[PDB]
């Protein structure tokens, strides 16, 4: 995708994450764990539902039309009837092919985008108390107990609290 996260700097996905689309894995002194990010997950899902609902929007209802199968050879009028229908079908078949190609490219790019938004947001939250390892993982340079991890994940992590500690560990 355009943002280089999914199938990019993030090596692969997590089959274990069954309660969300994007999320967090951590290691600290208390062990290791996993949690889904609801907001990113919901942003992707809402966009995908949005496009799905636009695409399946019922828009055509037709009644009496032209005949499209013929039991007799007739020539000119029938040639025209068949050509009109064949023309229509090819144009609609093209529309359908193009639609799915554009939609799917965009769905891949928007999902890649949402991964990237979460990663950049997290990075910003951590300010100077962490470093980007380059594989979607932050090395956090201080004691970050489970209350501290959950603080990062639920948007309450105050970086000032841990800054002196972390700055010291980083420039040694």
């Amino acid at each position: 995708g355009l943002f280089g996260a999914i199938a990019g700097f993030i090596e692969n996905g997590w089959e274990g994450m069954i309660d969300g689309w994007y999320g967090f894995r951590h290691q600290n002194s208390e062990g290791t764990g996993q949690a889904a990010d609801l907001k990113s997950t919901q942003a992707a899902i809402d966009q995908i539902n949005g496009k799905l609902n636009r695409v399946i929007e019922k828009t055509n209802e037709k009644f009496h039309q032209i005949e499209k199968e013929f039991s007799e050879v007739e020539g000119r009028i029938q040639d025209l009837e068949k050509y009109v229908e064949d023309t229509k079908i090819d144009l609609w078949s093209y529309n359908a092919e193009l639609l799915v190609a554009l939609e799917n490219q965009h769905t891949i790019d928007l999902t890649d985008s949402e991964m990237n938004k979460l990663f950049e947001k997290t990075g910003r939250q951590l300010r100077e108390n962490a470093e980007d390892m380059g594989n979607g993982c932050f090395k956090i340079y201080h004691k970050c107990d489970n209350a501290c991890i959950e603080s990062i994940r639920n948007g309450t992590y105050d970086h000032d609290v841990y800054r002196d500690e972390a700055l010291n560990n980083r420039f040694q």
Binding site: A7, G13, K58, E61, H64, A96, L102, K143
Partner: protein
């Protein structure tokens, strides 16, 4: 001794292949089908009024072939013609059959109003063993076969004004005898003529005498014609032989009515979209069941499947086997 926090995304064990701008096949976590490719094989009886033709074409029901008498005054949203249909009356053709079938199908009714035509100096209600009604000879219910009275067939000259506020459809015909003997026996004059007109149009038909292939006991034929008479206009019919006269008019309507050729059985269910293969659901935007449809239908495309991605790129862990 610090901590690691890794950002990631889900994956699934069984992803689906989709098409994009750059890839003809690439794997995502889920997708949904946009092409309806199946039918139940049955035509749902709601919400459209379905009239099963059974043994009858719409034209045979219109003319009043005796085995189609059950269709008198019928109405429909969709008239269904079956491949088993047959004609069993006087052999006939309709120049521009397809147009008459179309305009009647689209009108959605066979409502017929009898009018008091006065046919001075001819015998009415002619019949044939080619078109039995009960045990004896008969004819199309909506047509009146006129022949000589005594030894004469005078010039027929009649009128019917349209003083209603709706259009009238008149169905009439011309008899083509197979021999000169038949021509003169029935109509006296050696050559007939039928002229049917309104203020702005006219149709004149000259009969041709000669054998056509023997069908249901006749080498003769009737050719069927039609004339629409608008409010304030008038019908005139003028003939010195061979007229197959109208008995009245059909009431024309406009609306959503049509006709379809299908052998699918009619069943109790609800479906907006009908194809000759049967009803199909209309939740998907495209379909590959049949280019012939009626109602609120997906659009026909050539593809039998098109997958809309409903999830991210599916990236499983690098496989160790």
């Amino acid at each position: 001794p610090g901590a690691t926090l890794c950002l990631g995304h889900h994956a699934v064990p069984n992803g689906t292949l989709v098409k994009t701008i750059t890839d003809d096949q690439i794997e995502v976590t889920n997708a949904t089908e946009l092409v309806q490719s199946s039918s139940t094989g049955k035509i749902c009886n709601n919400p459209h009024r379905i009239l099963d033709g059974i043994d009858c074409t719409l034209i045979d029901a219109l003319l009043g072939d005796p085995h189609c008498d059950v269709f008198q005054n019928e109405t429909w949203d969709l008239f269904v013609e079956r491949s088993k249909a047959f004609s069993n009356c006087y052999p006939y053709d309709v120049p521009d059959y397809a147009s008459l079938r179309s305009l009647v199908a689209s009108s959605g009714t066979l409502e017929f109003i009898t009018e008091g035509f006065t046919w001075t100096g001819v015998t009415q209600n002619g019949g044939s063993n080619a078109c039995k009604r009960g045990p004896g000879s008969g004819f199309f219910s909506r047509l009146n076969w006129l022949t000589k009275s005594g030894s004469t067939y005078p010039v027929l000259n009649v009128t019917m004004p349209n003083n209603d506020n709706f259009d009238k459809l008149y169905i009439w015909g011309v008899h083509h005898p197979s021999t000169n003997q038949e021509q003169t026996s029935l109509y006296v004059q050696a050559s007939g003529r039928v002229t049917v007109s309104t203020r702005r149009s006219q149709q004149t038909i000259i009969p041709n005498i000669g054998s056509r292939p023997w069908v249901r006991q006749a080498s003769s034929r009737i050719s069927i014609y039609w004339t629409i008479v608008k409010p304030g206009d008038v019908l005139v019919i003028n003939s010195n032989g061979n007229l197959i006269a109208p008995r009245g008019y059909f009431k024309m309507r406009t609306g959503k009515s049509s006709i379809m050729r299908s052998d699918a059985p009619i069943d109790t269910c609800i479906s907006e979209c009908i194809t000759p293969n049967g009803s199909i659901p209309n939740d998907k935007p495209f379909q590959n069941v049949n280019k012939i449809t009626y109602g609120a239908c997906p659009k026909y495309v050539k593809q039998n499947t098109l997958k809309l991605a409903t999830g991210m790129r599916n990236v499983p862990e690098k496989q160790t086997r």
